[PDB]
Structure formats: structure tokens, C-alpha cells
Design an enzyme around this catalytic site. Sequence first.
Site, PDB file in Angstrom:
ATOM      1  CG  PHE A  47     -12.096  -7.340   5.574  1.00 57.26           C
ATOM      2  CD1 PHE A  47     -12.005  -6.612   6.768  1.00 57.26           C
ATOM      3  CD2 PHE A  47     -10.931  -7.918   5.067  1.00 57.26           C
ATOM      4  CE1 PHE A  47     -10.783  -6.446   7.408  1.00 57.26           C
ATOM      5  CE2 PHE A  47      -9.710  -7.759   5.712  1.00 57.26           C
ATOM      6  CZ  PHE A  47      -9.636  -7.021   6.880  1.00 57.26           C
ATOM      7  NE  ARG A  78      -5.085  -8.041  -0.311  1.00 57.81           N
ATOM      8  CZ  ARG A  78      -4.079  -8.709   0.240  1.00 57.81           C
ATOM      9  NH1 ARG A  78      -3.704  -8.441   1.480  1.00 57.81           N
ATOM     10  NH2 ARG A  78      -3.452  -9.646  -0.450  1.00 57.81           N
ATOM     11  CG  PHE A 113      -8.263  -0.612   5.786  1.00 59.59           C
ATOM     12  CD1 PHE A 113      -6.998  -0.446   6.360  1.00 59.59           C
ATOM     13  CD2 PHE A 113      -9.304  -1.058   6.596  1.00 59.59           C
ATOM     14  CE1 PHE A 113      -6.787  -0.706   7.705  1.00 59.59           C
ATOM     15  CE2 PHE A 113      -9.097  -1.318   7.946  1.00 59.59           C
ATOM     16  CZ  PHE A 113      -7.837  -1.145   8.499  1.00 59.59           C
ATOM     17  CD  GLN A 141      -4.751  -2.832   1.855  1.00 60.80           C
ATOM     18  OE1 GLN A 141      -5.322  -3.707   2.504  1.00 60.80           O
ATOM     19  NE2 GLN A 141      -3.429  -2.806   1.701  1.00 60.80           N
ATOM     20  CG  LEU A 181      -8.323  -4.902  11.667  1.00 59.85           C
ATOM     21  CD1 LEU A 181      -8.581  -4.228  10.326  1.00 59.85           C
ATOM     22  CD2 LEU A 181      -7.170  -5.884  11.547  1.00 59.85           C
ATOM     23  CG  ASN A 216       0.032  -1.919  10.142  1.00 59.07           C
ATOM     24  OD1 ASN A 216       0.275  -3.123  10.152  1.00 59.07           O
ATOM     25  ND2 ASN A 216      -0.757  -1.339  11.035  1.00 59.07           N
ATOM     26  CG  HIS A 260      -4.459  -1.957  11.023  1.00 63.69           C
ATOM     27  ND1 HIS A 260      -3.810  -1.947   9.842  1.00 63.69           N
ATOM     28  CD2 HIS A 260      -4.438  -3.267  11.468  1.00 63.69           C
ATOM     29  CE1 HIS A 260      -3.400  -3.194   9.550  1.00 63.69           C
ATOM     30  NE2 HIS A 260      -3.785  -4.001  10.547  1.00 63.69           N
TER      31      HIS A 260
HETATM   32  C1  LIG Z   1       6.605  -1.920   4.994  1.00 67.46           C
HETATM   33  C2  LIG Z   1       7.281  -1.654   3.640  1.00 67.46           C
HETATM   34  N1  LIG Z   1       6.891  -0.330   3.126  1.00 67.46           N
HETATM   35  C3  LIG Z   1       5.775  -0.276   2.160  1.00 67.46           C
HETATM   36  C4  LIG Z   1       4.461  -0.501   2.870  1.00 67.46           C
HETATM   37  C5  LIG Z   1       3.671  -1.585   2.478  1.00 67.46           C
HETATM   38  C6  LIG Z   1       2.474  -1.854   3.117  1.00 67.46           C
HETATM   39  C7  LIG Z   1       2.062  -1.042   4.167  1.00 67.46           C
HETATM   40  C8  LIG Z   1       2.844   0.025   4.573  1.00 67.46           C
HETATM   41  C9  LIG Z   1       4.045   0.308   3.932  1.00 67.46           C
HETATM   42  N2  LIG Z   1       4.824   1.383   4.421  1.00 67.46           N
HETATM   43  C10 LIG Z   1       5.461   2.396   3.585  1.00 67.46           C
HETATM   44  C11 LIG Z   1       6.968   2.172   3.357  1.00 67.46           C
HETATM   45  C12 LIG Z   1       7.437   0.779   3.686  1.00 67.46           C
HETATM   46  O1  LIG Z   1       8.350   0.655   4.492  1.00 67.46           O
HETATM   47  O2  LIG Z   1       0.867  -1.495   4.639  1.00 67.46           O
HETATM   48  C13 LIG Z   1       0.410  -2.511   3.734  1.00 67.46           C
HETATM   49  O3  LIG Z   1       1.552  -2.835   2.916  1.00 67.46           O
END
Ligand SMILES: CCN1Cc2cc3c(cc2NCCC1=O)OCO3
Length: 164
Positions: A59, A54, A112, A62, A121, A101, A125
Amino acid sequence: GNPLVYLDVDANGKPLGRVVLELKADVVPKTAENFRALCTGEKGFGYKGSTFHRVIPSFMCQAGDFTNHNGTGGKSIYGSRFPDENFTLKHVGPGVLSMANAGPNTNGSQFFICTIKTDWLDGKHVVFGHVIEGMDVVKKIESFGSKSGRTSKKIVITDCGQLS
Ligand SMILES: CCN1Cc2cc3c(cc2NCCC1=O)OCO3
């Protein structure tokens, strides 16, 4: 005593160069250590061979989803996710390195690199470092992005590791 780490990045199998990052272990040791170890691959998994999936011009770029390669995955060296360590460092400008996140306390491996000040942010973040050199390489990555985030070339972290 902050680590210096690197990402070597390709676009469609051709090198763009090296991004060198300082990790702010002095402020966010747990978050810095996660990224450091994912660069070296010393836990048996990490960023080597994964993509910038992404990329949004004016911006950020990622990366770090080495499990699903699409923004839904990733995992930390501690477990699937870990808490927000602090929000002491701010998204002050281009070159800021910060954790992606999916809400509070969901840091994994996705991260990112900002190409503008992303101060909206701040407090949401965890910032944990910045670009030391290779901002030109980040701008090359940025140029293969789009407003949707979809990349026009496959952007791959071919190698990564620790310099000091
Ligand atoms: C939140 C679900 N998931 C995967 C994940 C996906 C994300 C992210 C952080 C994470 N966390 C690691 C383990 C987990 O629980 O930020 C952008 O997309």
C-alpha cells in the site's frame, strides 16, 4: 524547475539509505514548496528526526507527523493546514508522493509514498511528486510495516534536505 529533495532513513538506529524525491512545483507549487521547506527545516521545524509511523505493505509508507509522531498531528509552513491545491496528478503506481489528510482541505505535513497504484485516492489526496531514486530504500521501510500499519522497528528520517 522542480526541486530534488532527499530523506535519509534509519531503522532502529541503522541506515537504510536515501530516498530522492522530485517535487512537482510545475503542477502544485504551494504543496511542493511546503514539502521542500519541511525537508530543509528552514522555517524552524520539519521532518528531520521524525518517523514513518504507519507503514502498510503493498500500500504505502506514511510519515511527516513531527508534532505528535502518531498520525494525529503535523503542520504546514503556512499554518496548521492548507487547501487541496488541485488533483491534477494521479496515484499512478509505486513511488507516488502524496499528501495525507483528514478530509477536504486539511493538508499539513503528513505525507505518504505509495508502494502500489492507489488510484482510489485520486481526487481525494493531492499528489505532488515521486521517487527519483531509492525505491529500494522505500521497499526496506515497507518491509518493517504490517497490515495494521504498526512498524516492527522505529523508522526515523535522520536527515533531509534539498539537492537542487
Ligand atoms: C486534521 C487535524 N490536523 C492534523 C492533521 C492530521 C492528519 C492529517 C492532516 C492534518 N493536518 C494538519 C493540521 C490539522 O488540522 O492527515 C492525516 O492525519
